[PDB]
């Protein structure tokens, strides 16, 4: 059974979605492949909810209370074989001094969501 | 740009987790599969937060809030190239009288959560 770590972000507080979505995509992510190459996470996802997917969503829940759509602006998602190589990741020293400070350049760190669950996947 | 549809779950009030897990991955799944084919649906993950994953987001989320995990029993995730292909499976006759019915033997209906959101993707 495969492991999915889920990261509910809130953008950094009076950061613009623009320049959220941007640092996320054109930053952090070139930033993260290497460590998550070098641990053996299997497969990297990210989600975003901006102005581009945000009628799509509405279309998608409409006849939905607003309570019930989810608000974050970025969510990751890292599947691996097991918790260990997220964990000796995060407490890599280099990732300590790259990915660990620049989450402070794009999410509201008084804020973050998370999970840890078993998945199934299918392709076509 | 791929999208994602994610749909979180509550079980069923009163239905025990292990009940629910194995309705959702042994009938609910199989129910679904020839819909997501003939749909266009790239990519269908199911997430289980039971108790074999667990210890596994207890250990990840080890020092943060309890408030701050989320609960959900299951998530489901569906990557498609348009909403279109979504919308279209929905309304499907043959999905109105299987995949529909069939919620109710898992899900508390009353409580399900929703987004749409764009994705990147990448694989090692
Ligand atoms: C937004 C965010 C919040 C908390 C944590 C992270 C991101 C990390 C770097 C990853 Cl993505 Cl593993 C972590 O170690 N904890
Ligand atoms: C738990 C759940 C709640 C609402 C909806 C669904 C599941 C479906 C069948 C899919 Cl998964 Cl597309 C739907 O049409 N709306």
């Not at 054109?26 to 989600?47: C, D, E, Q, S, W």
């Not at 945000?54 to 969510?75: F, R």
């Not at 918790?83 to 995060?90: P, V, Y």
Request: hydrophobic residues 35%.
């Amino acid at each position: 059974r495969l492991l999915c770590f889920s990261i509910y972000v809130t953008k950094k507080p009076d950061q613009s979605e623009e320049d959220h979505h941007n640092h996320v995509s054109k930053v952090n992510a070139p930033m993260m492949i290497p460590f998550l190459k070098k641990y053996g996470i299997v497969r990297y996802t990210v989600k975003h909810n901006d102005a581009y997917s945000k009628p799509k969503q509405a279309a998608l829940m409409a006849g939905q209370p607003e309570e019930n759509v989810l608000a974050y602006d970025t969510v990751f998602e890292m599947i691996v074989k097991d918790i260990e190589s997220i964990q000796t990741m995060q407490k890599d020293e280099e990732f300590l001094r790259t990915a660990i400070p620049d989450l402070f350049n794009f999410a509201d760190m008084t804020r973050t969501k998370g999970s840890g669950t078993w998945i199934e996947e299918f392709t076509f």
